[PDB]
Design a protein around this ligand. Structure first.
Ligand SMILES: O=C(O)c1ccc(C(=O)O)cc1
Length: 299
């Protein structure tokens, strides 16, 4: 029979532990363990911008027991930018979006600038010398830095990492000068005074950090850059399986503790149905491609 095999749910996060990509699915997984009695196991599988872990899910059996929980790179973005691809992201089977989260500009608290305009001047004063970390080539932090440079006429050197976690280590350590992270992973550091967020790349401020202005409020209205964390299944996963999984994830997102934890970090829980999720990924893929084009995004 089917029912007599307990099967674990395996969720690959294709980025190092401790960033938002890792934290949000782990928070949610605590509320799914009851429905997957053989266990919910998150594995962090790093490399190639998120494409190593992504490929591993892509090639797994399309039974819904192996899923990718990822930010946009290996779902919507990197196939527009990379020299090659070992899988076809257009064939992901969308399950849901766990959260959307705005990106920010974050610096070390010793950087002698108080706001975005002063940061621009610092970059122009030290042209080609100021370095920006990223979460990897083709991640939203990469493209967000690029959009910033496009809109401001600045020239900064890209230093890609494997994800948020090692980038934040180096920004704290002073080994990079700026990072366009999402708010959720940078907020604890900002609150602690360990890092300093200069602006939020959205049309409104975050309720989690209400005193930090948007980029629009600082003279850069087109500096909008919002990431997200989706769940996708291998190509060919049945529609009713995807639907059942989306209902399980959506149910987790509404649980009070998951709501508290997402809210305190400025992550907006979504839980969108598979169709809406697929429409969103399509629209996002094109939106980020339009950034690649307008901002001359370079590997
Ligand atoms: O592309 C992104 O927005 C993104 C990439 C990596 C991580 C992480 O390492 O947690 C989070 C977000």
């Amino acid at each position: 029979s089917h029912m007599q095999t307990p099967q674990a749910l395996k969720i690959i996060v294709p980025y190092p532990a401790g960033g938002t990509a890792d934290i949000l699915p782990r928070v949610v997984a605590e509320k799914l363990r009851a429905q997957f009695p053989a266990g919910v196991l998150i594995d962090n599988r790093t490399g190639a911008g998120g494409n190593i872990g992504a490929e591993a899910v892509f090639r797994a059996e399309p039974d819904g027991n192996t899923l990718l929980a990822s930010p946009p790179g290996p779902i919507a973005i990197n196939h527009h930018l990379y020299r090659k691809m070992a899988f076809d992201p257009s064939k992901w089977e969308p399950v849901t979006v766990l959260a959307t989260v705005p990106n920010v500009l974050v610096v070390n608290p010793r950087l002698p600038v108080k706001n975005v305009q002063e940061f621009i001047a610092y970059a122009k004063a030290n042209p080609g010398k100021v370095t920006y970390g990223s979460q990897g080539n083709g991640t939203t932090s990469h493209l967000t830095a690029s959009l910033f440079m496009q809109l401001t006429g600045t020239e900064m050197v890209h230093v890609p990492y494997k994800g948020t976690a090692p980038a934040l280590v180096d920004l704290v350590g002073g080994q990079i000068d700026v990072f366009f992270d999402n708010i959720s992973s940078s907020l604890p550091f900002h609150q602690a005074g360990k890092l300093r967020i200069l602006g939020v790349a959205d049309e409104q401020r975050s309720a989690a950090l209400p005193e930090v202005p948007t980029f629009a409020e600082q003279g850069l209205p087109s500096m909008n850059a919002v990431t997200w964390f989706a769940v996708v299944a291998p190509p060919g996963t049945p529609a009713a399986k995807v639907a059942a999984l989306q209902k399980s994830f959506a149910g987790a997102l509404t649980q009070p503790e998951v709501q508290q934890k997402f809210a305190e970090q400025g992550a907006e829980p979504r839980g969108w149905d598979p169709a809406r999720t697929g429409q969103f990924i399509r629209a996002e893929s094109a939106k980020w491609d339009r950034v690649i084009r307008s901002a001359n995004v370079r590997l």
